Coordinates of N, CA and C in Angstrom, one line a residue:
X1077 N -4.8 -13.8 -1.2 CA -6.6 -12.5 -1.4 C -6.4 -12.4 -2.4
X1078 N -7.6 -12.5 -3.9 CA -7.9 -12.0 -4.8 C -7.6 -10.5 -5.4
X1079 N -7.1 -10.1 -5.8 CA -6.9 -9.1 -6.7 C -7.6 -8.5 -7.9
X1080 N -8.1 -7.5 -7.5 CA -9.3 -6.7 -9.2 C -8.3 -6.0 -9.6
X1081 N -8.7 -5.9 -10.8 CA -7.5 -4.1 -10.9 C -8.8 -3.1 -11.9
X1082 N -8.5 -1.4 -11.2 CA -9.2 -0.2 -12.0 C -8.5 1.1 -11.6
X1083 N -9.5 1.5 -12.7 CA -9.1 2.7 -13.0 C -9.6 3.6 -11.3
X1084 N -9.3 4.9 -11.0 CA -9.5 5.6 -9.6 C -8.2 6.3 -9.1
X1085 N -8.5 7.0 -8.2 CA -7.6 7.7 -7.3 C -8.2 7.2 -5.4
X1086 N -6.9 6.6 -5.4 CA -7.4 6.1 -4.0 C -7.2 6.8 -2.8
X1087 N -7.2 7.7 -2.6 CA -7.9 8.6 -1.5 C -9.8 8.5 -1.9
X1088 N -10.3 8.2 -2.6 CA -11.1 8.1 -3.2 C -12.3 6.5 -2.9
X1089 N -10.7 5.7 -3.1 CA -11.8 4.4 -2.6 C -12.6 4.1 -0.9
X1090 N -12.9 3.6 -0.9 CA -14.3 3.0 -0.3 C -14.3 1.4 0.6
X1091 N -14.5 1.6 1.4 CA -13.4 0.1 1.7 C -12.7 0.2 3.2
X1092 N -12.1 -0.9 3.2 CA -11.9 -1.0 5.3 C -10.6 -0.1 4.8
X1093 N -9.7 -0.4 4.1 CA -8.3 0.0 4.2 C -7.4 0.5 2.8
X1094 N -6.8 1.3 2.4 CA -5.4 1.8 1.3 C -4.6 1.5 2.6
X1095 N -3.3 1.0 1.3 CA -2.4 1.1 2.4 C -1.3 2.6 0.9
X1096 N -0.6 2.7 2.2 CA 0.4 3.3 1.9 C 2.3 3.6 1.3
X1097 N 3.2 3.3 0.3 CA 4.6 3.3 0.5 C 5.2 3.9 1.1
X1098 N 6.0 4.3 1.8 CA 6.2 4.8 3.1 C 7.4 5.1 3.1
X1099 N 8.4 5.9 3.7 CA 10.0 6.0 3.9 C 9.4 5.5 5.4
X1100 N 10.4 4.3 6.2 CA 10.5 3.9 7.4 C 10.0 5.4 8.8
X1101 N 10.2 6.2 8.4 CA 10.5 7.2 9.5 C 8.9 7.8 9.1
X1102 N 8.0 7.5 8.3 CA 6.9 7.8 8.6 C 6.9 9.5 8.3
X1103 N 7.6 10.1 7.3 CA 7.5 10.8 7.0 C 6.6 10.9 5.5
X1104 N 4.9 11.2 5.2 CA 4.8 11.8 4.1 C 5.4 12.7 3.7
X1105 N 5.2 12.8 2.0 CA 5.4 13.1 1.2 C 4.9 14.1 0.1
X1106 N 5.4 13.8 -0.8 CA 4.3 14.1 -2.6 C 3.8 13.2 -3.1
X1107 N 3.6 13.4 -4.2 CA 2.7 12.3 -4.7 C 0.8 11.7 -3.9
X1108 N 0.6 10.4 -4.3 CA -0.7 9.7 -3.8 C 0.2 10.6 -2.1
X1109 N 0.9 10.3 -1.4 CA 1.1 10.3 0.1 C 0.7 12.2 0.0
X1110 N 0.8 12.9 -0.9 CA 1.0 13.7 -0.6 C -1.2 13.9 -0.7
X1111 N -1.7 13.3 -1.8 CA -2.4 13.4 -2.1 C -3.8 13.1 -0.5
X1112 N -3.1 11.9 0.3 CA -3.1 11.7 1.5 C -3.1 12.3 2.8
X1113 N -2.8 12.7 2.4 CA -1.7 14.1 3.2 C -3.4 14.8 3.4
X1114 N -3.1 15.4 2.2 CA -4.5 16.5 2.0 C -6.1 16.5 2.3
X1115 N -5.9 15.0 1.6 CA -7.9 14.7 1.9 C -7.5 13.9 3.2
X1116 N -7.0 13.5 3.6 CA -7.0 12.7 4.5 C -6.8 13.3 6.4
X1117 N -6.6 14.8 5.9 CA -6.2 16.0 6.7 C -4.8 15.2 7.5
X1118 N -5.0 16.7 8.7 CA -3.2 16.2 9.4 C -3.2 15.2 10.8
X1119 N -4.3 14.9 10.8 CA -4.5 14.0 12.0 C -3.4 12.0 11.2
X1120 N -3.2 12.0 10.0 CA -2.9 11.2 9.7 C -1.4 11.4 10.3
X1121 N -1.1 12.4 9.5 CA 0.7 12.4 9.7 C 0.8 12.8 11.7
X1122 N 0.5 12.9 12.3 CA 0.3 13.4 13.8 C 0.0 11.7 14.0
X1123 N -0.3 10.7 13.5 CA -0.4 9.6 14.3 C 1.4 9.4 14.0
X1124 N 1.2 9.2 12.9 CA 2.6 8.9 12.9 C 3.4 9.7 13.4
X1125 N 4.1 10.8 13.4 CA 4.1 11.2 14.1 C 4.9 10.6 15.7
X1126 N 3.1 9.9 15.8 CA 3.5 9.6 17.6 C 3.7 8.7 17.6
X1127 N 3.9 7.0 16.1 CA 4.4 5.7 15.7 C 5.6 5.6 16.3
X1128 N 6.4 7.1 15.3 CA 7.8 7.1 15.7 C 8.1 6.2 13.8
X1129 N 9.4 6.9 13.9 CA 10.4 5.4 12.6 C 10.3 3.7 13.7
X1130 N 9.8 3.4 11.9 CA 9.9 1.4 12.0 C 11.4 1.1 11.9
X1131 N 10.9 -0.1 11.8 CA 12.1 -0.6 10.8 C 11.6 -0.6 9.0
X1132 N 12.8 -0.8 7.9 CA 12.6 -1.2 6.6 C 11.5 -2.0 6.2
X1133 N 10.2 -2.0 5.4 CA 10.0 -3.7 5.2 C 8.8 -3.9 6.6
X1134 N 8.9 -3.0 7.6 CA 7.8 -2.9 8.5 C 7.1 -2.4 8.3
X1135 N 5.3 -2.7 8.8 CA 4.3 -1.8 8.1 C 3.7 -1.0 9.8
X1136 N 3.2 -0.3 9.8 CA 2.8 0.6 10.4 C 1.0 1.0 10.3
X1137 N 0.2 1.2 11.2 CA -1.8 1.8 10.9 C -1.5 3.1 12.1
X1138 N -2.2 3.9 10.7 CA -2.8 4.7 11.6 C -4.3 4.7 11.2
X1139 N -5.4 5.5 11.3 CA -6.3 6.1 11.0 C -6.3 6.7 10.0
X1140 N -7.8 7.3 8.9 CA -7.6 7.4 8.1 C -8.3 8.5 7.5
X1141 N -8.3 9.7 9.1 CA -9.1 11.1 8.8 C -9.8 10.9 8.2
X1142 N -9.6 12.2 7.1 CA -10.8 12.0 6.7 C -11.6 11.5 5.5
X1143 N -10.4 10.2 4.6 CA -10.8 9.5 3.8 C -11.8 8.7 4.2
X1144 N -12.7 8.3 3.0 CA -13.7 7.4 3.9 C -13.5 5.6 3.9
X1145 N -12.4 6.1 4.2 CA -11.5 4.4 4.4 C -11.3 4.0 6.0
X1146 N -11.7 3.4 6.7 CA -10.8 3.3 8.8 C -9.4 3.2 8.5
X1147 N -8.5 2.7 8.0 CA -7.0 3.4 8.1 C -6.2 2.8 7.3
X1148 N -5.4 3.5 7.2 CA -3.9 3.4 6.5 C -3.4 2.6 6.5
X1149 N -2.7 0.9 6.3 CA -1.2 1.1 6.3 C -0.1 1.5 5.8
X1150 N 1.1 2.2 6.7 CA 2.0 2.7 6.0 C 2.8 1.1 5.7
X1151 N 3.5 0.9 4.7 CA 4.0 0.2 4.2 C 5.3 0.0 3.7
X1152 N 6.4 0.8 5.1 CA 8.0 1.1 5.0 C 8.7 0.0 3.8
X1153 N 9.1 1.2 2.9 CA 9.6 0.5 1.2 C 11.2 0.8 1.1
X1154 N 12.2 2.4 2.0 CA 13.0 3.0 2.4 C 13.0 3.6 3.2
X1155 N 14.1 4.5 3.1 CA 14.6 5.0 4.6 C 16.1 5.5 4.4
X1156 N 16.2 4.4 5.7 CA 17.4 4.5 6.3 C 18.3 3.5 5.4
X1157 N 17.1 2.3 5.2 CA 18.2 1.7 4.1 C 17.8 1.9 2.5
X1158 N 18.0 1.9 1.4 CA 17.2 2.3 0.3 C 16.2 1.0 -0.5
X1159 N 15.7 1.8 -1.8 CA 14.7 0.4 -1.3 C 15.3 -0.9 -2.7
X1160 N 14.8 -1.9 -2.4 CA 15.3 -2.8 -3.6 C 14.0 -4.0 -3.6
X1161 N 14.3 -5.0 -3.8 CA 13.0 -6.3 -4.3 C 12.6 -6.7 -3.3
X1162 N 13.2 -6.2 -2.5 CA 13.6 -7.4 -1.0 C 12.8 -6.4 0.0
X1163 N 12.7 -5.1 -0.2 CA 12.1 -4.7 1.0 C 10.8 -3.9 0.2
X1164 N 11.1 -3.9 -1.2 CA 9.1 -4.1 -1.5 C 9.0 -5.7 -1.1
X1165 N 9.0 -6.9 -1.3 CA 8.1 -7.8 -0.4 C 8.0 -7.4 0.6
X1166 N 8.9 -7.2 1.9 CA 8.6 -7.4 2.7 C 7.3 -6.5 3.6
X1167 N 7.7 -5.2 2.5 CA 6.7 -4.5 2.8 C 5.3 -4.5 2.6
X1168 N 5.4 -5.1 1.1 CA 3.4 -5.7 0.6 C 3.9 -6.5 1.5
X1169 N 4.2 -7.7 1.5 CA 4.0 -9.2 3.1 C 3.5 -8.1 4.7
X1170 N 4.8 -7.0 4.8 CA 3.8 -7.0 6.7 C 2.4 -6.1 6.4
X1171 N 2.3 -5.0 5.5 CA 1.1 -4.3 4.9 C 0.1 -5.7 5.3
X1172 N 0.2 -6.4 5.1 CA -1.3 -7.8 4.2 C -1.5 -8.5 5.4
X1173 N -0.5 -8.4 6.2 CA -0.5 -8.9 7.6 C -1.4 -8.2 8.8
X1174 N -1.3 -7.2 8.8 CA -1.6 -5.9 9.0 C -2.8 -5.9 9.0
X1175 N -3.3 -5.7 8.0 CA -4.8 -6.0 7.7 C -5.1 -7.0 8.0
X1176 N -4.9 -8.1 7.9 CA -5.0 -9.3 8.2 C -5.5 -9.3 9.6
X1177 N -4.3 -9.4 10.7 CA -4.8 -9.2 12.1 C -5.9 -8.0 12.8
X1178 N -6.4 -6.9 11.3 CA -7.1 -5.9 12.0 C -9.0 -6.4 11.3
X1179 N -8.8 -7.9 10.5 CA -9.6 -8.9 10.4 C -10.9 -7.8 9.7
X1180 N -9.7 -7.5 8.6 CA -10.1 -6.3 7.1 C -11.0 -7.4 6.3
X1181 N -11.5 -7.0 5.2 CA -11.9 -7.9 4.0 C -11.2 -6.5 3.1
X1182 N -12.0 -5.8 3.0 CA -11.0 -4.9 1.6 C -10.0 -3.8 1.8
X1183 N -9.1 -3.9 0.8 CA -7.6 -3.7 1.2 C -7.7 -2.8 -0.3
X1184 N -6.1 -1.7 -0.2 CA -7.1 -0.7 -2.0 C -4.8 -0.7 -2.0
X1185 N -4.8 -1.4 -3.1 CA -2.9 -1.0 -3.2 C -2.4 0.1 -4.1
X1186 N -1.9 1.0 -4.2 CA -1.6 1.9 -5.6 C -0.5 1.0 -5.9
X1187 N 0.4 1.5 -7.5 CA 1.1 0.3 -7.6 C 2.7 1.2 -7.8
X1188 N 2.8 1.7 -6.8 CA 3.9 2.0 -6.0 C 4.8 3.0 -7.1
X1189 N 4.8 2.8 -8.1 CA 5.6 3.3 -9.4 C 6.8 4.3 -8.8
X1190 N 6.0 4.9 -8.2 CA 6.7 6.2 -7.6 C 8.1 5.9 -6.7
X1191 N 8.0 4.7 -5.7 CA 8.5 4.3 -5.0 C 10.4 3.6 -5.8
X1192 N 10.0 3.3 -6.8 CA 10.7 1.9 -7.0 C 11.3 2.3 -8.6
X1193 N 11.5 3.8 -8.2 CA 12.8 4.3 -9.6 C 13.5 3.7 -10.7
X1194 N 14.4 2.7 -9.7 CA 15.2 1.4 -10.1 C 15.7 0.6 -9.7
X1195 N 14.5 -0.3 -9.3 CA 13.7 -1.7 -9.8 C 13.7 -1.8 -11.0
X1196 N 14.1 -3.3 -11.9 CA 13.0 -3.6 -12.6 C 11.9 -3.4 -13.1
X1197 N 10.9 -3.2 -14.0 CA 9.1 -3.1 -13.3 C 9.0 -4.5 -13.0
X1198 N 8.8 -5.2 -13.6 CA 8.4 -6.7 -14.2 C 8.3 -7.2 -12.1
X1199 N 9.8 -7.6 -12.0 CA 10.0 -7.8 -10.9 C 9.6 -7.2 -9.6
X1200 N 9.3 -6.2 -9.2 CA 8.3 -5.7 -8.6 C 7.4 -5.5 -8.8
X1201 N 6.3 -6.5 -10.1 CA 4.9 -6.1 -9.6 C 4.9 -7.9 -9.4
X1202 N 6.4 -8.6 -9.5 CA 5.5 -10.0 -9.8 C 5.8 -10.8 -8.1
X1203 N 7.2 -10.0 -7.7 CA 7.0 -9.7 -5.7 C 5.8 -9.2 -5.1
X1204 N 5.1 -8.4 -6.1 CA 3.8 -8.2 -4.5 C 2.5 -9.1 -5.2
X1205 N 2.3 -9.2 -6.5 CA 1.9 -10.5 -6.8 C 2.0 -11.7 -5.8
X1206 N 3.3 -11.9 -6.0 CA 3.0 -13.0 -5.1 C 2.8 -13.0 -2.7
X1207 N 3.4 -12.1 -2.6 CA 2.8 -11.4 -1.5 C 0.9 -11.0 -1.2
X1208 N 0.5 -10.5 -2.5 CA -0.6 -10.5 -2.9 C -1.4 -12.6 -2.7
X1209 N -1.0 -13.0 -3.6 CA -2.2 -14.3 -3.5 C -1.1 -15.1 -2.6
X1210 N -0.6 -14.7 -1.9 CA 0.0 -15.5 -0.4 C -1.9 -15.1 0.8
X1211 N -1.5 -13.9 0.8 CA -2.1 -13.4 1.5 C -4.0 -14.0 2.0
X1212 N -4.3 -14.7 2.7 CA -5.4 -15.4 3.1 C -7.5 -15.1 2.5
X1213 N -7.7 -16.0 2.2 CA -8.5 -15.4 1.4 C -9.6 -14.6 2.2
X1214 N -9.9 -13.8 3.5 CA -11.1 -13.0 4.3 C -9.9 -12.0 3.3
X1215 N -9.7 -11.4 2.4 CA -9.3 -10.3 2.6 C -9.4 -9.8 0.7
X1216 N -10.1 -9.1 -0.4 CA -10.4 -8.9 -1.6 C -9.7 -7.6 -1.4
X1217 N -8.4 -7.5 -2.1 CA -6.9 -6.8 -3.3 C -7.9 -6.0 -3.9
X1218 N -8.2 -4.6 -4.0 CA -7.9 -3.7 -5.4 C -6.5 -2.8 -5.6
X1219 N -6.3 -3.4 -6.7 CA -5.1 -2.2 -6.9 C -6.0 -1.0 -8.6
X1220 N -5.5 0.1 -7.9 CA -5.7 1.3 -8.0 C -5.0 1.8 -9.1
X1221 N -4.9 2.5 -10.0 CA -4.7 2.6 -11.6 C -5.0 4.3 -11.7
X1222 N -3.7 4.8 -12.6 CA -4.4 6.4 -12.9 C -4.8 6.3 -13.4
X1223 N -4.9 5.5 -14.4 CA -5.2 5.4 -16.4 C -5.7 4.3 -16.2
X1224 N -7.1 3.8 -17.5 CA -7.9 3.1 -17.6 C -6.4 2.2 -19.0
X1225 N -6.0 3.1 -19.2 CA -5.1 1.6 -20.3 C -4.2 1.1 -19.0
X1226 N -3.4 1.6 -18.0 CA -2.4 0.7 -17.1 C -3.3 -0.1 -16.7
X1227 N -4.8 -0.1 -16.4 CA -5.6 -0.8 -15.3 C -6.0 -1.8 -15.8
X1228 N -5.9 -1.8 -17.5 CA -6.1 -2.8 -18.4 C -5.1 -3.9 -18.5
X1229 N -4.2 -4.0 -18.3 CA -3.2 -4.2 -18.7 C -2.7 -4.6 -17.6
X1230 N -2.7 -4.3 -16.5 CA -2.6 -5.7 -15.2 C -3.3 -6.9 -15.2
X1231 N -4.4 -5.9 -15.6 CA -5.7 -7.3 -16.2 C -4.7 -8.5 -16.9
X1232 N -4.7 -8.2 -17.8 CA -4.0 -8.7 -18.9 C -3.2 -9.8 -18.5
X1233 N -2.2 -9.1 -17.8 CA -1.4 -9.5 -17.9 C -1.6 -10.6 -16.5
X1234 N -2.6 -10.6 -15.5 CA -3.3 -12.0 -15.0 C -4.4 -12.6 -15.9

């Protein structure tokens, strides 16, 4: 799949879905997940509670409540297993699978930076970019960044 990198707030993304890095318990916490809980409304966490725990590396789909997208795809990157480069790759891959299975076209990611605190930056980027390019061309991915400087730096790398 093609990826474009832009500056923005993922809670503002217009399209089919946004990906949300998560613990495998699907309990949402601070940061973007926080923006998702608040801008999205309680229905996101309710469904996550109705879904229950999944495995690390797996993904789960819920509605997006009040966001301007149809779905949130929660990608389990840690929880009862610590974050690793391997959980990142799998979670990324699992999330893209859910998107294809759902017949979606447009999907957004954030950098996941807050979740990968002790992994080498360039490795995380590599594996995620590898899984994204692998996904079918029926999917158009957006990478959403807080700052223009960062958005541009991702663009350059490609």
